[PDB]
Structures are given as structure tokens and as C-alpha cells.
């Protein structure tokens, strides 16, 4: 702010002001609020809580069976070298 003498800035907005209204009042709000609809315990989703496999491992079962059977052919006898 600058004040300049001799033209000085009025020393106030004075008493000639026009009170325009008495509408100043905010009427307090008084209220009762009830949000009470029956609630049912459940919601349907496509899927909740699953941690789906991105790849599975290979998996398997097992079997064996049979017996011990055989047809054989042997090497001929040979002269013994030494000993």
C-alpha cells in the first residue's frame, strides 16, 4: 500500500455503506437417516480366490507287469590258453 499526501486514502470505508440484506442465516439442518434394507449373505462372481495354473507339470500313473522268461544261444567252448 501507498498513501499519498495531500491526496490521502480515505481512512476507512465509512458509515455511508448500504446494508443490503439481513439474509445471513443458515438454518441448521435437522435430519434422521435410515439405510435398512435386508442384506443377504452372498454375492455371485465368476471367480474369486483362485490362483489358476499358468502351466501344469507333466503328471502320470504307473504300471508294470510280467514274468522272467527267455530263449538263449551260448558261445562255443574254446581251448584254454594259460593257467
Amino acid at each position: 500500500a501507498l498513501i499519498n499526501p495531500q491526496f490521502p486514502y480515505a481512512g476507512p470505508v465509512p458509515i455511508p455503506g448500504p446494508a443490503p440484506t439481513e439474509t445471513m442465516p443458515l438454518l441448521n439442518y435437522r435430519v434422521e437417516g435410515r439405510i435398512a434394507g435386508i442384506q443377504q449373505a452372498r454375492q455371485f462372481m465368476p471367480f474369486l480366490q483362485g490362483p489358476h495354473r499358468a502351466v501344469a507339470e507333466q503328471t502320470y500313473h504307473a504300471i508294470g507287469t510280467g514274468i522272467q522268461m527267455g530263449q538263449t544261444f551260448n558261445q562255443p567252448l574254446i581251448n584254454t590258453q594259460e593257467g
Binding site: 439405510i35 435398512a36 434394507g37 435386508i38 442384506q39 443377504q40
Partner: protein, 49 residues
């Protein structure tokens, strides 16, 4: 909607209205919790004639 419908003609119109409960997609002020089975909502539509 056709700008004009001439004598003897039939015009076809399409109109959409969004009836809001929630203020917007991100501001849920005004939304309605409807999970109370026996107690239904009502959306009354009064059409032109």
C-alpha cells in the same frame, strides 16, 4: 430422428437417457445399495403419446 416426416411417410427415431443415482462413475454420492431381498426399486417411465 428425421428432421421432417412428409405426408404419407413413416419416420424412425432412437433416443437414450441416462437416469443417474450415483453422481458419476467415480463419485458414488447418490448411489443406491440394493441387496435387500424382498424390497424392490421402481423406475417409472411415462412415455409420449
Amino acid at each position: 430422428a428425421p428432421a421432417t416426416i412428409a405426408a404419407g411417410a413413416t419416420g424412425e427415431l432412437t433416443m437414450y437417457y441416462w437416469v443417474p443415482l450415483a453422481y458419476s462413475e467415480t463419485d458414488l454420492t447418490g448411489a443406491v445399495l440394493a441387496n435387500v431381498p424382498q424390497s424392490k426399486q421402481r423406475l417409472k417411465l411415462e412415455f409420449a403419446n
